[PDB]
Symmetry: C2
């Protein structure tokens, strides 16, 4: 029978867990039956042991079993996510949130998982909130947002109430652990595609492994400068997940005509500063930030195409649609229509 | 930089040895109620899986000792010895350290024993002593009087380390052994300079030895090659011998002193009442495998005391230990120990 001394002892002995043990642990944590000390011990122990795809898969599986689902037949089968682990410690503009809006305006259904900042000044949820977008909608209203606007936002705490004990321990110990991976892996709407950012180069492959087990079409991205984003300051490492297999690639924006940028050119601020930065990009303003948004939006579109079916043509078409979605004003319009939807 | 949990924990998760003072900072935060249980647990686990260094463990123990209740000045003889282990060998044996401690004290060697109740066994040293009528929870002044009048004193770790309670609680909750399990033997409040120190975790005995070496203590850190945190009689033992601030590892065979091979079955104990009866049995002069184990461990502590020639030291240790029992001195010392607590 499973117990904490058994599982913790196994992890501290640097052993992989038996099937079901990670699942048992997470379920204890989600049902409020685990002491903070046990939660912390488990989180740390698994991280230093080096999590397997199976183990992390079991953790996310439990979370999704307890998560508030969206109503049946309300999420298109080709819906995409654009979200990162966060915690790169750079405080950039909200590239995922900006990319998600552009991708939606390009005609790709987007059901975005998100959350407030943890280590940054303003996270996606914070910036969206500052734009007038509603980040408090339940399953039904998110479904309506998807249908009517083309984009929905699932605020993780709203859909994962049982995760509050784990989230508290994350806050207390501060150090990143395997828990930092679970957000991007537990979109309640369960889209089968997405552009997933990972700040931790050593854990990106594991994330990709989990998505692969689900037969998802995902690009797990880690900027070689440390961003949990497709960066423009240098190359990016992409773990391409397609047909249940992971393929490690290095991506260079220069190969698609993009100039190198400095990190301070992508720097952000508070929610109001970042909101203004969203408006600028969608407004047609050229520069480093636009390039970053277009590239990331294109990545999400590449991930989308990996569902129904190569690499260079997909990116070239992705870059086209993302740029066009901005230049026609569609992305700017979608945001406006999104804000109005909430007030209605 | 600014000391913080994200910093230190982050360093441990990255599998880097800590900088000087960081381990001390962490332990001090824990020892002052300024650490959340989650932070306590994260640190304990992280410090364990990285693999703690002698420097780091030394800082943890140091902080504990800098907070602990000390014994009054000039109450602890300079040649006082300790007999204690980390516990957690998994084998429910009789209480060899406590029994040896009584024998050693009866032989004339001052013993100030550190100790605690059971954590995973059916009965710890403190539990068995309590069942014998010995007062275990005495404060500094009375432990000093005990040491003077009786020739032995017992420091109950919860009594002398009240600020360790938060760490102790967390250890209880997570169950798994951590670096904290090493601290007990390393934090005797009376700070005896010699001792026989048991370590259940073979891979960490050298670390414990390094800590004692840093204090230039005369210590034998023992790990039975059958898993016991004791000098065993079922097979050979690993001894990390600490003398002159230097550690030297070696294999020890009690057969070289005439001791027959025993089996773990013969050293098995039970609850406090059973183990207490086992103590009375040995001190009564009963021959058998239990007596051999006690005399062996008692001798080791005497050898450690002497460290303040290897073979002759053991021969005199085994001789003095056997005599302390057979003369009835060890039995009498226990009885006198009980009367002290009752007056
Ligand atoms: O504070 P951090 O730990 O650094 O994380 C920053 C944000 O990144 C994650 O979401 P998201 O991918 O949507 O962020 P983004 O839109 O800004 O790119 C996370 O939910 C945070 O909101
Ligand atoms: O339950 P455990 O975790 O296994 O530990 C058993 C005992 O060992 C330690 O003391 P001590 O060295 O005095 O033990 P002993 O007298 O029985 O030999 C510890 O303080 C416990 O009292
Ligand atoms: Mn992001
Ligand atoms: Mn980011
Ligand atoms: Mn012992
Ligand atoms: Mn023992």
């Amino acid at each position: 029978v499973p117990s904490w001394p058994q599982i913790l002892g196994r992890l501290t002995d640097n052993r992989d867990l038996a099937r079901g043990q990670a699942a048992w642990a997470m379920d204890q944590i989600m049902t409020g039956n685990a002491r903070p000390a046990q939660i912390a011990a488990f989180a740390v122990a698994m991280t230093m042991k080096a999590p397997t795809a199976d183990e992390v898969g079991e953790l996310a599986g439990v979370m999704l079993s307890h998560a508030h689902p969206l109503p049946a037949d309300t999420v298109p089968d080709d819906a995409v996510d654009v979200v990162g682990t966060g915690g790169d410690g750079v405080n950039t503009v909200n590239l995922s949130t900006m990319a998600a809006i552009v991708v939606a305006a390009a005609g790709v259904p987007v059901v975005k998982h998100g959350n407030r900042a943890a280590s940054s000044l303003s996270g996606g949820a914070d910036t969206l909130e500052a734009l007038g977008v509603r980040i408090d909608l339940g399953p039904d209203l998110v479904a309506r947002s998807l249908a009517e606007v083309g984009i929905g936002f699932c605020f993780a705490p709203r859909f994962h109430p049982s995760y509050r004990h784990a989230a508290a321990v994350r806050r207390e110990i501060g150090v990143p652990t395997v828990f930092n991976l679970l957000g991007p892996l537990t979109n309640p709407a369960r889209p089968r595609a997405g552009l997933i950012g990972c700040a931790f180069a050593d854990l990106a492959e594991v994330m990709a492994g989990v998505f692969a087990a689900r037969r998802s079409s995902v690009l797990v991205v880690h900027g070689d400068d440390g961003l949990d984003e497709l960066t423009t300051t240098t190359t990016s490492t992409i773990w391409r997940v397609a047909a249940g297999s992971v393929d490690k690639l290095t991506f260079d924006p220069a190969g698609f005509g993009f100039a190198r940028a400095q990190l301070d050119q992508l720097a952000g601020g508070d929610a109001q500063a970042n909101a203004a930065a969203v408006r600028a990009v969608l407004g047609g303003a050229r520069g480093p930030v636009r390039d970053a948004v277009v590239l990331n939006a294109a990545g999400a579109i590449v991930a989308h195409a990996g569902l129904s079916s190569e690499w260079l043509p997909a990116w070239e078409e992705g870059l086209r649609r993302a740029s066009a979605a901005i230049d026609t004003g569609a992305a700017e319009q979608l945001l406006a229509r999104w804000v109005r939807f909430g007030r209605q």
